[PDB]
Amino acid sequence: TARGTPSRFLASVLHNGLGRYVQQLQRLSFSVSRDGASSRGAREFVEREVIDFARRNPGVVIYVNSRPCCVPRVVAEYLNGAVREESIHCKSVEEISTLVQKLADQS
Amino acid sequence: PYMTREQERGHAAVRRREAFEAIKAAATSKFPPHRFIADQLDHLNVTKKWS
Amino acid sequence: VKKGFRAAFRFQKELERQRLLRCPPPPVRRSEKPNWDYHAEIQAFGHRLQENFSLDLLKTAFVNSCYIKSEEAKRQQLKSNQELSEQGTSFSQTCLTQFLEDEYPDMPTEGIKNLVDFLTGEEVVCHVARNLAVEQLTLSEEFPVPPAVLQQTFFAVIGALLQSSGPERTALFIRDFLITQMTGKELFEMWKIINPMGLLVEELKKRNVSAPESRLTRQSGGTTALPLYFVGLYCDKKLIAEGPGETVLVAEEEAARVALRKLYGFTENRRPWNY
Amino acid sequence: IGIRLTLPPPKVVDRWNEKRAMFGVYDNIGILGNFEKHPKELIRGPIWLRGWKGNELQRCIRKRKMVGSRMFADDLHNLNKRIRYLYKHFNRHGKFR
Amino acid sequence: LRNRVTDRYFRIQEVLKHARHFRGRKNRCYRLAVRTVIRAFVKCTKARYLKKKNMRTLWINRITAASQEHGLKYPALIGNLVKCQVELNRKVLADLAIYEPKTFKSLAALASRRRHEGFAAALGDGKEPEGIFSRVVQYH
Amino acid sequence: RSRAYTPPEDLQSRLESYVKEVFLPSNWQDISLEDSRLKFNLLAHLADDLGHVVPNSRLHQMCRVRDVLDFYNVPIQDRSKFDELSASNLPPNLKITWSY
Numbered sequence: 141t142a143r144g145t146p147s148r149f150l151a152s153v154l155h156n157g158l159g160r161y162v163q164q165l166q167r168l169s170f171s172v173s174r175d176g177a178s179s180r181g182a183r184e185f186v187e188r189e190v191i192d193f194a195r196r197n198p199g200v201v202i203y204v205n206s207r208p209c210c211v212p213r214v215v216a217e218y219l220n221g222a223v224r225e226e227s228i229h230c231k232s233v234e235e236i237s238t239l240v241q242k243l244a245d246q247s
Numbered sequence: 248p249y250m251t252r253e254q255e256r257g258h259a260a261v262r263r264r265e266a267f268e269a270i271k272a273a274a275t276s277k278f279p280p281h282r283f284i285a286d287q288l289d290h291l292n293v294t295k296k297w298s
Numbered sequence: 299v300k301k302g303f304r305a306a307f308r309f310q311k312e313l314e315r316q317r318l319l320r321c322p323p324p325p326v327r328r329s330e331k332p333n334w335d336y337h338a339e340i341q342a343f344g345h346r347l348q349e350n351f352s353l354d355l356l357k358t359a360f361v362n363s364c365y366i367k368s369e370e371a372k373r374q375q376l377k378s379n380q381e382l383s384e385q386g387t388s389f390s391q392t393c394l395t396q397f398l399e400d401e402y403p404d405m406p407t408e409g410i411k412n413l414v415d416f417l418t419g420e421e422v423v424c425h426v427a428r429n430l431a432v433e434q435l436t437l438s439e440e441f442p443v444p445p446a447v448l449q450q451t452f453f454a455v456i457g458a459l460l461q462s463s464g465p466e467r468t469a470l471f472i473r474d475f476l477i478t479q480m481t482g483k484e485l486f487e488m489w490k491i492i493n494p495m496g497l498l499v500e501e502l503k504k505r506n507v508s509a510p511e512s513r514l515t516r517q518s519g520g521t522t523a524l525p526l527y528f529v530g531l532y533c534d535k536k537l538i539a540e541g542p543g544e545t546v547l548v549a550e551e552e553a554a555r556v557a558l559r560k561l562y563g564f565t566e567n568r569r570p571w572n573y
Numbered sequence: 574i575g576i577r578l579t580l581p582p583p584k585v586v587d588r589w590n591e592k593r594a595m596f597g598v599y600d601n602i603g604i605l606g607n608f609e610k611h612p613k614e615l616i617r618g619p620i621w622l623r624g625w626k627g628n629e630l631q632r633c634i635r636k637r638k639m640v641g642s643r644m645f646a647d648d649l650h651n652l653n654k655r656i657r658y659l660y661k662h663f664n665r666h667g668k669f670r
Numbered sequence: 671l672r673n674r675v676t677d678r679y680f681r682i683q684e685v686l687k688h689a690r691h692f693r694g695r696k697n698r699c700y701r702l703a704v705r706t707v708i709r710a711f712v713k714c715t716k717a718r719y720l721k722k723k724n725m726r727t728l729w730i731n732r733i734t735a736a737s738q739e740h741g742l743k744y745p746a747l748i749g750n751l752v753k754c755q756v757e758l759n760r761k762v763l764a765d766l767a768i769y770e771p772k773t774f775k776s777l778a779a780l781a782s783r784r785r786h787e788g789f790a791a792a793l794g795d796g797k798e799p800e801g802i803f804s805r806v807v808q809y810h
Numbered sequence: 811r812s813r814a815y816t817p818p819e820d821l822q823s824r825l826e827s828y829v830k831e832v833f834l835p836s837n838w839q840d841i842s843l844e845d846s847r848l849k850f851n852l853l854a855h856l857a858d859d860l861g862h863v864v865p866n867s868r869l870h871q872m873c874r875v876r877d878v879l880d881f882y883n884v885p886i887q888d889r890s891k892f893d894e895l896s897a898s899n900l901p902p903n904l905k906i907t908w909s910y
Contacts, residue, residue: 141688141710141711141714142714143691144688144690144691153429154426154429154430154475154478155478155479155481158474158478158481158573159470159473159474159475159477159478159573160347160348160474162346162347162348162430163346166342166431167333167339169333174296174297174891174910175296175297176296177293177294180293180295183295183296183297186895190904191898191900191901191904194901194903194904195901198341198342198345198346198901198902198903199342199345199346200342200903201335201338201339201342201903201905202903202904202905203333203905203907204906204907205332205333205907205909206906206907206908206909206910207907207909208909208910215333219429219430219431220428220429221428297890297891298888298889298890298891299577300575300576300577300674300675300676301581301676302581302676303580303581303584304676304677305576305676305677305679305680306576306577306579306580306581306676307580308677308680309576309577309578309679309680310580313578335905338902338903338905341902341903342903574679575678575679576676576678576679
């Protein structure tokens with residue numbers, strides 16, 4: 141509900157559309173299990189989409205730690221000091237790519 | 248009415264007949280779908296790893 | 299004792315989250331947190347604002363003097379930051395004065411100087427630099443960064459941009475990042491003054507207009523605790539201003555401020571900045 | 574609070590134990606061993622269900638009719654009661670008939 | 671007990687996180703919290719429709735206030751703003767009334783002018799030249 | 811010892827010499843490998859020389875010398891995914907870590 145959840149007003153970071161559009165996404169941190177099914181499609185993401193996505197927007201830093209993890213992770217850190225961590229456990233390549241585009245598109 | 252009862256007799260029987268043969272052909276072609284080796288091997292793909 | 303492992307591990311993670319909530323760790327800098335490479339991230343900082351930088355000049359702009367002093371203190375157990383900061387501050391003040399007198403020619407030099415000192419002050423520059431990844435790439439002593447060090451770092455970034463790709467691109471950078479902080483803010487929330495009635499009298503004397511008459515137009519509930527006085531300020535048989543207030547003196551002061559906004563062109567309905 | 578505080582000690586599983594590494598051997602002793610022995614002759618357990626499968630009532634009937642001559646007295650009485658209850662349940666109770 | 675529930679605390683906390691701002695044992699006891707959070711979610715679901723209805727009535731009240739401030743009425747203002755093909759809605763009209771009242775006075779003058787044009791047109795019945803503001807713009 | 815196979819540019823002449831000494835006529839691409847001894851000798855010589863061995867799964871796929879030539883002209887290369895991603899001309903905002 142809305143009385144149990146805190147609310148805010150619509151705003152921007154530093155008037156993001158006035159002079160120029162600044163990509164508000166600093167970073168992204170996948171942790172990818174080399175041997176593990178849970179990061180399986182995520183591995184294929186590292187095989188196929190992450191290079192093209194990185195060349196699509198040079199203002200974003202992408203780290204793949206490739207540690208022996210059990211749940212793979214994307215960490216979208218932003219210009220205003222906000223960090224949003226999401227799990228890419230057992231999700232397909234195209235839908236992970238849409239999630240990454242969601243992370244890049246937002247503030 | 249633009250037509251009498253005698254004028255309208257049989258004037259759209261052809262289209263009704265073809266519509267019924269179409270829905271009949273749709274009804275009589277209910278039969279289980281094909282199976283592929285590629286789907287079985289694609290589920291075999293669940294333990295792809297890196298090297 | 300229920301057998302299993304997943305529920306216990308989930309409860310361990312929730313206990314970790316609640317322990318971090320009840321007693322947060324001190325804020326460590328981004329450099330000694332994982333997933334940090336300085337060169338790729340300063341390149342992404344250059345490409346993020348959509349221009350090009352000379353990477354050595356930007357790297358020398360992001361390194362301070364107290365950092366060098368502390369590193370030479372710690373070696374017993376690099377270029378400075380001053381010249382790029384000086385060039386950036388000088389060109390920033392000059393460009394801000396140019397922009398503020400270009401679109402607002404009726405404003406006096408004192409108000410333009412105070413507007414520039416507001417846009418180059420610690421609050422505006424620290425608010426801009428904390429949302430442009432200047433603080434994370436800043437090599438400073440204590441985290442959180444003191445405002446003077448971060449201000450010098452931001453103006454050194456401006457100076458490095460000047461030396462890299464020209465005064466036109468740097469003027470555009472200042473236009474899109476320092477001007478945009480005065481949108482939605484009134485003149486006297488930036489240029490604070492005391493007793494604007496005498497300054498209005500001086501301004502009208504400079505315009506060779508007779509001294510204004512304070513004149514009570516409207517009012518409501520004068521003998522109550524919640525009055526509503528409009529006072530109009532009149533010059534040559536006609537008003538130059540009208541302002542509301544709770545008392546007569548406060549309404550007179552507010553109408554004087556409205557008069558200063560109207561004669562200097564800083565009304566609420568002025569022409570917006572052309573980006 | 575119905576959950577443990579500390580994580581349990583790690584369950585070490587030897588996947589290459591003597592039982593695990595050679596599980597399933599000789600299960601095709603009939604089709605490629607000249608049929609001298611049946612695979613149901615290689616499973617170890619109670620003598621009334623070596624190579625046989627049934628529900629609870631058939632299991633109880635077979636257990637009685639094979640080993641009830643040497644069961645314990647109260648175990649015999651409890652199994653007779655279980656047989657009687659299962660007869661009354663399977664033949665007189667249910668949804669489909 | 672071969673396999674009993676080990677993941678029960680988190681279901682309780684998944685329910686209880688929406689009851690933390692309640693009064694009395696609705697915020698602690700699980701039964702009361704289940705019933706009251708169920709009721710709260712259904713109330714939110716119907717209160718979306720209630721929000722739309724109440725905000726339309728608030729817009730109508732504000733436009734009626736501004737219209738009677740300009741001497742008009744709400745039915746006259748709306749019915750003779752739609753006849754000028756001025757297809758504004760109640761939210762924009764309310765916002766113009768609250769913040770920008772010279773535009774709303776111009777809209778009220780337009781509505782009253784169209785009202786007098788239609789009122790004179792419906793009085794002198796027959797073939798007559800239409801009013802200047804009473805013309806319609808046909809779209810084909 | 812590795813799977814790293816780069817097909818030699820003059821492998822044509824080596825294969826000609828090997829089919830010459832293990833047997834013979836023109837149109838050598840269509841010589842049948844139906845005899846087991848000839849296939850064994852040819853593939854053993856090729857595996858001893860080139861260091862690349864025909865797998866058991868592809869041993870029945872080849873029945874002509876043309877299939878042998880087509881098998882030995884494909885580069886099979888082996889490295890970790892660290893050595894493949896980092897050598898794939900990464901953009902300067904991609905940093906790849908391997909804690910193994």
